[model samples]
Target: ADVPAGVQLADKQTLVRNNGSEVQSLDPHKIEGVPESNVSRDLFEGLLISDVEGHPSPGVAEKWENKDFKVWTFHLRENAKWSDGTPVTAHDFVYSWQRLADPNTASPYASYLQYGHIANIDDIIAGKKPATDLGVKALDDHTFEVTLSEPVPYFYKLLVHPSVSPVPKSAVEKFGDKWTQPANIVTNGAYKLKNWVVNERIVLERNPQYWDNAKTVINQVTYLPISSEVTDVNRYRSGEIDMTYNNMPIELFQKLKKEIPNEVRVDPYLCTYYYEINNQKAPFNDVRVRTALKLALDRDIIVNKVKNQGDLPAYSYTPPYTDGAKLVEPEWFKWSQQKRNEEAKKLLAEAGFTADKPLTFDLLYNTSDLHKKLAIAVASIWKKNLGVNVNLENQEWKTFLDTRHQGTFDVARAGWCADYNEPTSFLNTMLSDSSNNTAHYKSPAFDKLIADTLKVADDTQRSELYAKAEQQLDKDSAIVPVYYYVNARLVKPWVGGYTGKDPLDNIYVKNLYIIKH
Candidate 1:
């Protein structure tokens, strides 16, 4: 039982990390944001898992093949087992995917299967068909077959998302909503939930039943819900935690990078920070007003002066790193700031707003130092550029999400990290029926383009279709594309395999280990 002479082990084989905010839910189907996704990725394993570089690798399913990217067949590993010591079967995935598409579940991510082109997903989510009518079928105890509505070249990448992870049907049915509680949960990931203290910490221990348990080096992992980037840094510096959240304090980024060059990490991430305008609301309903507001924004200033975090200015919703997608540069993107301001002023005046009757709206953002600073900077820019009156408001993470979901605000801050490395992950949210489309943006033409992209098997045609969708979004001014994200964080030097190569920034604890200090 003793360690080999060359093997290294820490005093305590535990990895403590800062997981931004309190998670919304443990149920994979019900969760909607990054906090929940991060926790879910550890507590459940999907058919395919992302390696450190964000490439798809085998997980529960040892191998899989597709027929013209339309029908996917996966063979589960015989040794794969759930935390409860039960063999993981193909039926579990079939049930989990069905539950995700079931209207009765009311999952915010119910439309996720649509991206995968799963057959009858739209009908099932719309309540036109039963959950049992989904296209997934179990050929045998370990064989899973999925029939797609059309050819989806990037379908395997979508499998890496936790939204499609298998759930134990027995536990869910037995306890209903209570099944996700720490005492009742059954998971298939390398780690099992051991303890959860609300708004504080969540603890996980290596699952002995995991097929690769012997290869998992870290024995325990702890996630602390520290929302404040400053607090996260303080904790990390004080040796209370091993890693900080992706969003570090913008003010201290350069200082930290200089002070600890090896610890500070900055990598190109597949996410976009934006302001979601309520397309159904008063002033925003007018395309001229929306266009004016978007044009008035100085994204260069916001990224360079305000954030100063090496983030790229985003003219398009889809990040440049997305595979086979072209950036749709708007006409204004080439115009100088002075020209953009002039156009914005003219448009606002055309919308009948003047000095006597200035355009006014409240900007809602979640709690964060960076968010607050950005709101102030943006509001100042609007006032100086277009003579608009902007009110700023802040709320907790959960409250802000609820307000946006209920369409209770004029403009709310929002961000979308790709669920997969494809353009659809960012473009699909603008669809009228998408649950995540809180802005209420509806464009039949845009929807058709996205639909067409799914049907096309040619890479060139799909890229063109994706480009057209982005262009449509830009023309409609559906959302203000502020800036693309950069994964900036601090990791202790003692940690190994913490490479920030994944554009999705999916940090799997299974691939991480601690070195003796």
Candidate 2:
């Protein structure tokens, strides 16, 4: 009975703790964002797997080699099998990736893998060609080959992240019109999605017929999507829940630490909270207004009062703590406003801002009390320092994302989590030509460098290119970075064997164990 040991077990007679997985869907191709997609990652590991530290290691594919240091081929495990007892084939990977990039689906991140990461997917997503022109294909059922438009050393690591896995085509076809529906889901990993009622509870049962069942720990794991911080803490206190994350409130965090004394953890994430301009639309079309808005930010006030010291304000596009393969430190490791201000002022002045003439623009943020406070604070700084005014607009989170995805808002607050442990994870995607740079601030030079970086295999040379690109983002006022994120989590003492790692700092349940005393 886990009821009293932090996680309330469902049955009184159960001796072994139940492992559960609650997912939005079983289709790997359709899901996006963390926790939502992590459920899928646990369901499958591709040519590679990430270690407890979130480092890459061999998975279903025994080993892989770079072709001329550009292309790569992975040799699969001799005994890989799907959860349904069918042999998991290389064709599945090819089909799954192609399906994700297919025009009909219009996945939010379909272009991520297709463009430079997955080979020629860029062409298909752009209507330049067909799937046959893309780089990945199956040699036979077990063997698979991938061609890159260029060389990407960290490509395998990208493939292992939850978002990059292959989904079964049969599941896609069987569900047809509604493939992502829960009833049509299938899994090939350690656990299968038995059920999930969002913001409530997720139940996962062991995929006993899975390919590598012997190494799988725990028969079931459960996840509850607790949105209210107080309720989440109270549930954990009463042993109604096991873990909580993402939206931890300060009041609850301090209260739980003082009262419980044994179940708190903090992890720094590779995420940047920033603001973007809708360069694709009017008003913000002028780079000066964009730079003026950035120069006016009183990062200290926002960091201290608005975020309430919750996060560190960022100046450059890249957040702190992003340790690269061969870089001494982050590109913006020592960049200061005093040093970069001359250029900032120059960019604004060049964009036509003067002491007598001020720039006018509307600033939008999440429509909440905290965002209202942040918006006012930012506005005050621009009004006081840079002689610009930003009108505030706020809305619900869903509304905010919808506006951003549609390129509707002028200036909006957003956060980015690095999919992998490299700078490219953040910089490459955000600035690449019309990729996540949904703002559409076009720069042929930026596009060329990003495309070339993906094709080269050397990590050191790439860092240099990445660093230059970061400086250019600063010069171009690409993304007005607000702060680097600090992710905090709370877990119970009974939740054992969990090792926190890269990517998701929330909960590392894949390596977690519920200790039975």
Best by lDDT: 1
Instruction: Please report how far candidate 2 places residue 516 from its true position, in Å.
Output: 2.4
How does model 1 score by TM-score? Answer: 0.97
Candidate 2 residue lDDT tens string, 1-517? 1123455332321112211123334556554455555566667666676666667776678888887646788888777776677777888778877777676666666766743366767678887877666678888888888887666666776766655566767877887756544566666776776766654566667777666676555677766654455566667667766666454554555565577656666567788877788876765777666665666576766777556535776776666467672323333325554434554567678876777776677777754444465577778876766667678887544456567778877788777787767777776665555345655577667767666675566777677777767766666666677787776556777665555555444232445555653
Which ranges of candidate 1 are over 4 A from the true structure?
1-7
By summed lDDT, the worst window of 10 consecutive residues in model 2 runs over 12-21
* Worst ten in a row by lDDT for model 1: 1-10
Candidate 2, TM-score vs. the true structure?
0.82
Please provide TM-scores, in order, for all candidate models, with all chains considered together.
Answer: 0.97, 0.82
Q: Which stretches of candidate 2 lie over 4 Å from their true place?
A: 1-26, 114-117, 253-262, 304-310, 325-399, 432-434, 454-458, 503-508
Total clashing pairs for each candidate: 0, 16
Best TM-score goes to which candidate? 1
lDDT by residue for model 1 (378-475), tens: 99998998898889998877778878878999998888999888899988988889988888899999999998876667888888999999999999
